[PDB]
Structure formats: structure tokens, C-alpha cells
Design a protein around this ligand. Structure first.
Ligand code: A1AJK
Length: 164
């Protein structure tokens, strides 16, 4: 199971870790990807997870988009987890650097409630431009299932914990 996490609430836990390395160690049922609507996994969490799959995630994703079209901001889809997890839940948080509505962050986190346990990043953090402290608050106030959050940056992790 998951190891070395700090308990934040009844159902939310946090660790200073690269989500990709955590997925390789744990091989969880569900790993969350910080996706965009096109499932173009270029950088951040998505680029890192895709690289770890040897680009198989991107090939699968391109076929999904060719069939279904883009996701919605706030939406998700379940695809394979490849070598990292049984499933990858690709969740689109709003990208504030693209002008997307930050109120869609709660909708994005609601997708987590469809899964009993998830390994996940903070949505809309990092290159998506939102305040990670706000993202953690929305996570705790929205997700009811068991969420193991991996935060790569140690200073941000320490700030998240000490201001919680
Ligand atoms: C202020 C600041 C500075 C540097 N990085 C960050 C973010 C980057 C995205 N991120 C991740 N957290 C967990 N596993 C991950 N794998 C790849 C990215 C990633 C959370 C922290 N924010």
C-alpha cells in the first residue's frame, strides 16, 4: 500500500513525492493525470507520466480523442494506467494561464468521487497557474473518497502543510 504520507483529514493524505515515482512504487488502482482537454501530455505531471509509459499513454490518448473529441474543462476520462497503475483518470482542471474559470476546479475534483482510492496531484497547480493552497482546500472540501496527494516541490509541500 501507500507509505510515508501525512494525514490531513479523514480521507486526504499528502506526501512530498514525484507522482510518477510514487506510481512506479505503489502501482495503484488509479493514478490521476493533470490533463488538458486534448490529452496532449507535454509537460508537468502529464508529460512526466506519459514519458514513464514510453509514450504509450499519448498513443492511447490520441486514439481516444480521434474517437470522442476533446474533454471539457472540469471533466475526465478513464484510460489505461499502462505500467504505472491499473487505470489513469485524466482530469482537466482549469488552466488559469489560458483564462479558464477557476470555479471549474471543484467540478474537476468531483471526478475523484467516482473512485474509492486515488494517487493524485493537486489539480490546476504547477504550470496550470492556480494557487496550490486553494487547490488543496477545494480538494479537501470536495473529495470524499481516499486521496493520496503527491506534491513534487518540497517548499510548496512544506507551505501546504504549515498553512493547512
Ligand atoms: C510552485 C511550484 C514549483 C515547482 N513545481 C510546482 C508544481 C509542479 C507540479 N507538481 C507535481 N507534483 C507531483 N508530481 C509531479 N510530477 C510532475 C509534476 C508534479 C506539483 C508542484 N510548483
Amino acid at each position: 500500500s501507500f507509505s510515508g504520507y501525512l494525514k490531513l483529514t479523514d480521507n486526504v493524505y499528502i506526501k512530498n513525492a514525484d507522482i510518477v515515482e510514487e506510481a512506479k512504487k505503489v502501482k495503484p488502482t488509479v493514478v490521476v493525470n493533470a490533463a488538458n482537454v486534448y490529452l496532449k501530455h507535454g509537460g508537468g505531471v502529464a508529460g512526466a507520466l506519459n514519458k514513464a509509459t514510453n509514450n504509450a499513454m499519448q498513443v492511447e490518448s490520441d486514439d481516444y480523442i480521434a474517437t470522442n473529441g476533446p474533454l471539457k474543462v472540469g471533466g475526465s476520462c478513464v484510460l489505461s494506467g499502462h505500467n504505472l497503475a491499473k487505470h489513469c483518470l485524466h482530469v482537466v482542471g482549469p488552466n488559469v494561464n489560458k483564462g479558464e474559470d477557476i470555479q471549474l476546479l471543484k467540478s474537476a475534483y468531483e471526478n475523484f468521487n467516482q473512485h474509492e482510492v486515488l494517487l493524485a496531484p493537486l489539480l490546476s497547480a504547477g504550470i496550470f497557474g492556480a494557487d496550490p493552497i486553494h487547490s488543496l482546500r477545494v480538494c479537501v472540501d470536495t473529495v470524499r473518497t481516499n486521496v493520496y496527494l503527491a506534491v513534487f516541490d518540497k517548499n510548496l509541500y512544506d507551505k501546504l502543510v504549515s498553512s493547512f
